[PDB]
Amino acid sequence: EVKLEESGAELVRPGASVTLSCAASGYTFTDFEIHWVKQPPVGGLEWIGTLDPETGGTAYNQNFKGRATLTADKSSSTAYMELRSLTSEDSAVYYCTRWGKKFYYYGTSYAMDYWGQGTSVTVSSAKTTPPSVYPLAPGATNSMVTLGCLVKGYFPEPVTVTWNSGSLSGGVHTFPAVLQSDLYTLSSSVTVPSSTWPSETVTCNVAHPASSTKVDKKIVPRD
Amino acid sequence: DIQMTQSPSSLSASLGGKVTITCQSSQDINKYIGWYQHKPGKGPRLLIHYTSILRPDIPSRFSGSGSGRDYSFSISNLEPEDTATYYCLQYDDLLLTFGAGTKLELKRADAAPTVSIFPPSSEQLTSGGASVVCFLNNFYPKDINVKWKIDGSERQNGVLNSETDQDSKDSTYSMSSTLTLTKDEYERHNTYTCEATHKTSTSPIVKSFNRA
Ligand SMILES: [Cl-]
Numbered sequence: 001e002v003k004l005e006e007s008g009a010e011l012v013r014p015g016a017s018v019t020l021s022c023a024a025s026g027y028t029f030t031d032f033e034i035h036w037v038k039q040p041p042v043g044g045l046e047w048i049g050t051l052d053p054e055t056g057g058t059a060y061n062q063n064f065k066g067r068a069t070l071t072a073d074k075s076s077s078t079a080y081m082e083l084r085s086l087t088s089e090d091s092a093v094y095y096c097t098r099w100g101k102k103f104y105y106y107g108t109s110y111a112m113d114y115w116g117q118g119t120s121v122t123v124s125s126a127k128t129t130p131p132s133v134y135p136l137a138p139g140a141t142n143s144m145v146t147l148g149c150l151v152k153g154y155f156p157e158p159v160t161v162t163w164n165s166g167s168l169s170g171g172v173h174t175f176p177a178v179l180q181s182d183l184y185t186l187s188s189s190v191t192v193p194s195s196t197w198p199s200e201t202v203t204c205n206v207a208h209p210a211s212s213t214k215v216d217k218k219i220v221p222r223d
Numbered sequence: 224d225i226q227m228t229q230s231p232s233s234l235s236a237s238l239g240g241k242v243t244i245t246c247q248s249s250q251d252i253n254k255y256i257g258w259y260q261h262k263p264g265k266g267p268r269l270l271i272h273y274t275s276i277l278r279p280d281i282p283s284r285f286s287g288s289g290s291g292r293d294y295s296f297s298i299s300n301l302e303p304e305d306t307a308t309y310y311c312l313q314y315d316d317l318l319l320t321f322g323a324g325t326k327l328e329l330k331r332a333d334a335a336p337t338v339s340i341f342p343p344s345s346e347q348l349t350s351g352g353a354s355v356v357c358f359l360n361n362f363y364p365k366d367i368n369v370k371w372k373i374d375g376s377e378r379q380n381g382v383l384n385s386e387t388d389q390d391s392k393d394s395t396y397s398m399s400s401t402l403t404l405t406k407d408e409y410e411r412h413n414t415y416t417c418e419a420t421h422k423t424s425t426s427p428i429v430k431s432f433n434r435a
Contacts, residue, residue: 037267044322045259045267045310047320050317061224061318111312112257112269113278115268116266134346135346136356138339139341146337146358146360148356150354175385175387175399176385177385187358191360
């Protein structure tokens, strides 16, 4: 029931701006402040600011005054954060989260009890590029075998990887993407019983929403 | 503005064991501190508010204490699902502040990497490229070094390495390493070797294949 639903990933050119949205449902919108929080690539959570959607009242950490602007639309139950005139220092994941507005002697119970799923913002002049997806199949036999997918040459993050559409979830390692010369590469491994492959079907499912790309790649033994 | 000093920055402890993290505020925060958990690849979660008050869906292993400027957070009877980064937050002001975070890892027995090497697919080759991939999976401890050899000779350029966060079931780490060449250059050589040094073996752990 209580939900905070954020907008999708944004690619922004240096010097340009973008506006993020967070749609609340499952509670009375105007009884809670909306706080925003930054999660930089390396290093820890930073509090950006608070908005009281009933009145338009705001407050910001100093470092974000001049950079972020918080508003809301009560009709749609939706909070917004405009991030203006960006650099790579502003590349990060941004969350909305709620805070109980009403004063109590021992403070609120609703202290960032629910969070949005995060919106990833990448500030760069590189171009959106779809991944190529290549199967990883062995070139020696044991009771377990390890297969893979190489997801190479894409921009920007993120991509989604699953195996047999969700069914193979055990023994999966999906490795963090590495950036080289404006293109990301990632890999994912799955381990299954050697009795089960290649006698049965194992497929990696890769999505890159920025490029509208969905691929299924069947892992077949090596020629 | 209230500053928060969270210590330590990193903690390593054994299964079943106990850890404590501290936070110190630049002025009295009157017990308005909360503690949050950030597990890898997920969003933050509230554990405790007003110094010691637990959510009811959080294990009783988690607790908190303190007053004035000095606070602590503790986990008893550590489980591998506790692996995460932890943050304090002060909210005794209009402007809130997070501490810098504490990354918690668990100790366990030494485990050798299970190593798999994969040649370039026909799909990649036909487009002109050739990547060779090595997975070094479910090892402990985290420190490992990987080198690529082509017909015996070391190649450092064109190598992309990626490490997982600690696994939240078996407390191991995994690593992927990808050597990217051209088709042209791949087809000039025969032997491709993934060579790993790890404390579990005196000499390297290797996997190779021959193109023909
Ligand atoms: Cl902060």
